[PDB]
A = this chain, B = another copy of it.
Amino acid sequence: FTLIELMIVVAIIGILAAIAIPQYQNYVARSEGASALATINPLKTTVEESLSRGIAGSKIKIGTTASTATET
């Protein structure tokens, strides 16, 4: 092992560092907003259809309970 060998390794370590890391939280925030909008968008169909069929607005709830003829 020579000192030139180790100094070249140190220089290449420094060069391999310093790689600029761009902003990434904006991408995550935008994806979260898109996911939320895509999650709550189909619920417009449920509310509108239930209101069209006469189901009371107070009877339109959120859950996995089996919807009856009066509750959705």
A7 touches B42 (CB 8 A): no
Copies per complex?
2
Size band of the interface chain A makes with B:
10 to 19
A52: CB under 8 A from chain B? yes
Closest to A12 in B: B52
Is the CB–CB distance between A44 and B11 below 8 Å?
Answer: no
Which B residues are CB-close (under 8 A) to A2?
45
Please provide the 7 A-B residue pairs with the shortest distance between their CB atoms, ordered closest to farther.
A11-B52, A7-B49, A4-B45, A3-B45, A4-B48, A7-B45, A11-B53
Chain A residues near B (Cβ < 8 Å):
2-4, 7-8, 11, 42, 44-45, 48-49, 52-53
